[PDB]
């Protein structure tokens, strides 16, 4: 694993000392080399999981996130290469360093076994994000947004830690697969119930429900492309991975400790998908769509069925990539205009003839057009939920419909009307942003082709 | 669709518009042009009957009864004119009706060909900046402090010089 980390810990001094004319290219290409080397984990010949020490490990549920992160790093770099163009070399170097620290932390956590290490990394993820969001935004409320982000996250963090302590004491160790081979069952009293809470509350507060979805839009809006990318892609996924790895112990509590959370997740999926219709701000629309899909993820995580877990992982990866892509497109249309509003720029596709086909290929992946990992996940999760009850296809379908609606609303208020006549600032497409779109897409094709990699624990 | 209307209207134009609308809906009801001519002549007689009258009372009464009769005996699916709203060509070509300023961002390897036309753009824009500032004073001098204006636009009271605000009208692409 050091083979993945150490070079990512060398990109930093590399950035510091390299000359301005060359740091961008050098660090970018070498981060791509890191992404490449990050595939050794896929030599999972047999079912014996990979273990490198008492301090690291890998797994089928973690490897995807690792590669996706090591591959979203350079895309953040590139998408962060036209703005802050008049900001000093030292400042842009700081930005690069923060991105790289995010990468390294995310890798170490998605790999680590001991949930306490996982937790310290899960909470160290903040500093770079808070910074990136406050020191490089474009509005004023970014401050309140960062505050909300930080404090939601830490409120979650605390009882999680307290329960990790209670465990480490009652049980002997915290190492995973030992928690498995020596788990037990609980008398199911108010004590163990509040323990279940203090263990899942943080992961949920992070992966937003209806009740606490508030810090997502502010972040994705006030913050720049890279922060938006990384939020929509991974910093949510951390909660899901933690919940998956930890729920192994709390059996059986999660049968009746789920109804409220499943209910909230579904209702929130619906209401947020509806708001996605009448939400002006494009990035806010995208954020609420992300909420709508992560609600499915959660409803599939709780009930603990194998189909459900595989669908969760599929939809997870798919949404990560697709949201990064949509945010790239938004930023693109913003740098030329400097207004997030959806109804200002209209009737494109007459001057950006190609870009549309990078807009289209995203929506179709949002509304679950097959053959896509998106629909595979949505469908397996709907199957699990139908088994768990026959009266949830209702909500699945309402969500599918409202999505099929607002995805096209977005396509049609930006690439289907008639062109304005005062947007003389429409610098044509840059090879760079076209490349970012292509790189976010192509992997969707290859994974639609061969998804056995992207299944999960149960496959 | 170039000139703009006044705020208020007059009995004259109201009656004219009612007439044209009713005649179109009649062309739609009664297909054959012979029947259309017949009933159009009948409507013309109906109008010429009360034409010479001038009492605002009878005017308003007849107009507001005429509009009700019209709305109650109109054609559900009328005859829309393709090139106008409601039709099957309205905006059909707006997807191709690009403006000019897309030109500037061409690449020189492309405007290499089509050289002549780009030899004349400059002397056109040159025909704009050289006579822009003047087009402002013509209004800022005649921006009557009375402050009660319409949307009309005065011409170049001088000779040789060009009018004001010709860019957003000239260069408007074709209809095709």
């Amino acid at each position: 694993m050091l083979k993945i980390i150490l070079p990512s810990l060398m990109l930093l001094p590399l950035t510091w000392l390299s000359s301005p004319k060359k740091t961008w290219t050098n660090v970018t290409s070498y981060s791509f080399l890191i992404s490449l080397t990050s595939l050794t984990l896929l030599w999972q010949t047999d079912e014996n999981y990979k273990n490198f020490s008492n301090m690291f490990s890998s797994d089928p549920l973690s490897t995807p996130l690792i590669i996706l992160t090591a591959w979203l790093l350079p895309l953040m770099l590139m998408a962060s290469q036209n703005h802050l163009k008049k900001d000093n070399n030292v400042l842009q170097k700081l930005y690069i360093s923060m991105l790289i620290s995010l990468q390294i932390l995310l890798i170490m956590t998605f790999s680590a076994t001991e949930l306490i290490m996982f937790y310290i990394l899960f909470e160290a993820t903040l500093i770079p994000t808070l910074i990136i969001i406050t020191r490089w935004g474009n509005q004023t409320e970014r401050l309140n947004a960062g505050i909300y982000f930080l404090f939601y996250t830490l409120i979650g963090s605390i009882p999680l830690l307290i329960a990790l302590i209670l465990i480490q004491n009652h049980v002997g160790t915290l190492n995973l697969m030992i928690l498995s081979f020596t788990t037990h069952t609980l008398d199911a009293s108010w004590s163990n119930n509040l323990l279940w809470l203090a263990c899942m509350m943080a992961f949920l507060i992070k992966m937003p429900l209806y009740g606490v979805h508030l810090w997502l839009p502010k972040a994705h809006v006030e913050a720049p492309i890279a922060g938006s990318m990384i939020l929509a892609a991974i910093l949510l996924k951390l909660g899901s991975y933690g919940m998956i790895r930890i729920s192994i112990i709390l059996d059986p509590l999660t049968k009746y400790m789920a109804y409220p959370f499943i209910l909230l997740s579904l209702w929130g999926m619906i209401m947020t998908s509806s708001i996605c219709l009448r939400q002006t701000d494009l990035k806010s629309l995208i954020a609420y769509s992300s909420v709508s899909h992560m609600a499915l993820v959660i409803a599939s995580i709780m009930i603990q069925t194998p189909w459900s877990f595989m669908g969760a992982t599929m939809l997870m990866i798919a949404h990560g990539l697709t949201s990064s892509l949509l945010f790239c497109l938004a930023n693109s249309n913003y740098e030329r205009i400097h207004s997030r509003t959806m109804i200002m720029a209209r009737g494109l596709q007459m001057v950006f003839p190609l870009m549309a086909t990078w807009w289209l290929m995203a929506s179709l992946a949002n509304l679950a057009l097959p053959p896509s990992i998106n629909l595979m996940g949505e469908l397996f999760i709907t199957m699990s939920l139908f088994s768990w009850s026959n009266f949830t296809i209702i909500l699945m379908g309402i969500n599918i419909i409202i999505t099929g609606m607002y995805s096209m609303y977005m396509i049609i208020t930006t690439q289907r009307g008639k062109l304005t006549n005062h947007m003389i600032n429409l610098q044509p497409s840059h090879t760079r942003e076209l490349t970012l779109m292509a790189l976010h897409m192509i992997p969707l094709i290859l994974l639609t082709t061969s998804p056995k990699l992207i299944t999960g624990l149960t496959m | 669709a170039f000139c703009a209307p006044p705020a208020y209207l007059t009995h004259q134009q109201k009656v004219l518009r009612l007439y044209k609308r009713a005649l179109r809906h009649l062309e739609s009801w009664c297909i054959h042009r012979d029947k259309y001519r017949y009933f159009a002549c009948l409507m013309r007689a109906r109008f010429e009957e009360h034409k010479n009258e001038k009492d605002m009372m009878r005017a308003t009464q007849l107009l507001r009864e005429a509009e009700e009769e019209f709305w109650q005996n109109q054609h559900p699916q009328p005859y829309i004119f393709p090139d106008s709203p409601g039709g099957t060509s309205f905006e059909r070509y707006e997807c191709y009706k690009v403006p000019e300023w897309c030109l500037d961002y061409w690449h020189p390897s492309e405007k290499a060909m089509y050289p002549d036309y780009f030899s004349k753009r400059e002397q056109w824009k040159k025909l704009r900046m050289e006579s822009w500032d003047r087009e402002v004073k013509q209004l800022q001098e005649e921006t009557s402090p009375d402050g009660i204006m319409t949307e009309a636009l005065p011409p170049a009271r001088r000779e040789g010089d060009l009018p004001p605000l010709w860019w957003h009208i000239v260069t408007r692409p074709r209809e095709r």
């Binding site: 007459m350 001057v351 950006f352 003839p353 044509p428 497409s429 840059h430 090879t431 | 690009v98 403006p99 000019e100 897309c102 030109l103 961002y105 061409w106 690449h107 390897s109 492309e110 089509y114 036309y117 692409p173």
Partner: peptide
């Protein structure tokens, strides 16, 4: 034989 206005397309 007339012109046809269009965007860049080279990029």
């Amino acid at each position: 034989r007339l012109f046809v206005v269009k965007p860049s397309l080279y990029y």
